[PDB]
Structure 1
Amino acid sequence: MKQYLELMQKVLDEGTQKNDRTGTGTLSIFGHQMRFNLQDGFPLVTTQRCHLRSIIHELLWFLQGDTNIAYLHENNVTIWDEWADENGDLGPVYGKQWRAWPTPDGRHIDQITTVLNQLKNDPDSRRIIVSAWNVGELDKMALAPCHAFFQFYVADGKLSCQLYQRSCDVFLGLPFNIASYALLVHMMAQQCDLEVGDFVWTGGDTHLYSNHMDQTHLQLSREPRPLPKLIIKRKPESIFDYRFEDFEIEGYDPHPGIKAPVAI
């Protein structure tokens, strides 16, 4: 998208050479923000073809509070295969913290539910937050949350959301994350009878892996196409009752996809 490609170009021009956890090496910048008015269309890249099936199921997976890949397998999504153990468990990652943040006094807090309640009863609240960064359980996670913290905001009947992503693989992960949260905002907005507002993306360590250079330059030479449209065929009783069939994307005509190795 225009914002996406400019960020990608920015990492190449200003990025600094860093040695990472994987030993692959990256080019990175620290601190960046981009806004997406969801009224203009669904922020799904067009300079690269994205598998919408994987994005929708992972989000529905998160909302269930599931941390076992069994569910993703039944739907043919193998994006979390590398980090899962023999049983398909990942530890108390994303979903677990969203749906059941464990407190020291034995209780469990459902952040998504409180957020829905805040949106409906106290939309002006400045504390409408969901955090996946549970310091007490990071050690038990197969991987620390990349998209770790997000906040909702309501103004003029429009629902906005800002995401703080501490670590970001610009080529492989970013376009997946943007679509994922944009989708959530739509689901939230529908359940709370609000209009969609802006999706603000804020990143920490924003990088481009050294073995993605060629693919990046390839994508950078492509002209972005008009943004698609997200259609939701029905309104479920709750935000936990959505299904894959409920979502329809229209006007999505992307350039052919680009293959690239994943850094584990």
Structure 2
Amino acid sequence: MKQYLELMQKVLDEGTQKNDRTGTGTLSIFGHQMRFNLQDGFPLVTTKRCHLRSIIHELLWFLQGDTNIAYLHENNVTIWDEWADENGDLGPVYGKQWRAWPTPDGRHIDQITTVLNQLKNDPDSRRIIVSAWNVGELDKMALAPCHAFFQFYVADGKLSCQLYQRSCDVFLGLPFNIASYALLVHMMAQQCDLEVGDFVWTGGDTHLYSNHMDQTHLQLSREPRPLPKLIIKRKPESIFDYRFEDFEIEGYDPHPGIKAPVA
């Protein structure tokens, strides 16, 4: 899409050389914001064929609160295979903090139910927030939360959401992250009987990897196709009762899928 391609070109223009946690090399900028009005369509990248398959399972996996990748193995999702121990555990990563943030005094906070209740009872609150950044349990996680903080906002009957992502692999991860949270907004809006508003994406270290130039340029050479439309074919009675087959997409006619060496 336009905002995505424009970000890639900005990294090429303003990016600085910055070695990463392994020495692969990136072109990096710090501080970026994008806005996706979900009324115009679902923000699924079209300059390369993407798939919601692993995005849906991981989101549902997040919402269940289980940080064991068992569910992903049963459904043939592999994005977490190289980070888990033998048990298949990742620590108190996203799912755990979303549903059971542990307190000092031995309690647990279900942030998802709090947000949903806030959106229903007090949609004007400026405190409708979910944070995966549990400073006290970062050392127990196989990976520090990347998309670690998002907030909801209601106005004119439209539900908006802003995400803060401390680190962004532009070519590989960003199309995945955008689609993931746009899905969450649609799911949250449906359970709150609201319309969808804007998805705001905010990034910290936003970077292209040195070995993604050929794939970047190939994608830049292509014109964005019309955005597709999300089709929820079934309305669950709970935000935690969604099923993989509930989600379809129409009018998604992308360019040939682009493949790079993964993470």
Measured against the shorter chain, the TM-score band is over 0.9
User: Runs of 4+ in structure 1 displaced over 3 angstroms?
Assistant: none
Aligned-pair identity in percent equals: 100
Deviations 1:106-127 (A, max 9, x none): 0000000001100000000000
Please, what TM-score do these two structures have when normalized by structure 1?
0.99
Residue equivalent to 2:249: 249
Q: Equivalent residue for 1:34?
A: 34
SS at match of 2:211: helix
1:143 match: 143
Structure 1, residues 52-78: CA drift from partner, whole Å, max 9, x if none?
110001000000001111101111111
Q: What do the CA deviations read for 1:54-105 (whole angstroms, capped 9, x no partner)?
A: 0001000000001111101111111111101111111100000000000011
Secondary structure in 2 aligned to 1:239? coil
d(CA) in 1 for partners of 2:4 and 2:165?
15
Q: CA deviation at 1:262?
A: 2.3
How big is the shift at 1:29? 0.3
Query: In 2, distance between residues paired with 1:22 and 1:172?
Result: 17
For each residue in 1:197-249, what CA deviation from the matched residue of structure 2 results, as whole angstroms up to 9, or x when unmatched? Answer: 00000000001111111111111111110000001111111000000111110
Aligned counterpart, 1:120: 120
CA distance in structure 2 between the partners assigned to 1:199 and 1:137 by the alignment: 28
- Matches of 1:157 and 1:246 in 2, distance apart? 24
- Structure-2-length-normalised TM-score: 0.99
Instruction: Give RMSD over aligned pairs.
Output: 0.6
Alpha-carbon separation, structure 1, partners of 2:218 and 2:187: 34
Task: Report Cα offsets for 1:27-65 as digits up to 9, x if no partner.
Answer: 100000010000000000000111211000100000000
Q: Which runs of 5+ in 1 are unaligned?
A: none
Instruction: Give the Cα separation in 2 of the matches to 1:214 and 1:146.
Output: 25
Q: Secondary structure at the match of 2:125?
A: coil
Q: How does 1:28-177 map onto structure 2 within 5 Å?
A: 28-177=28-177
Give the distance between the partners of 1:204 and 1:157, measured in 2 at CA.
Answer: 30
Q: Distance in 1 between matches of 2:120 and 2:89?
A: 34
The Cα offsets for residues 8-41 of structure 1, whole Å up to 9 and x where unpaired, read as: 0100111000011021011100000010000000
SS at match of 2:182: helix
2:10 counterpart of 1:3: no
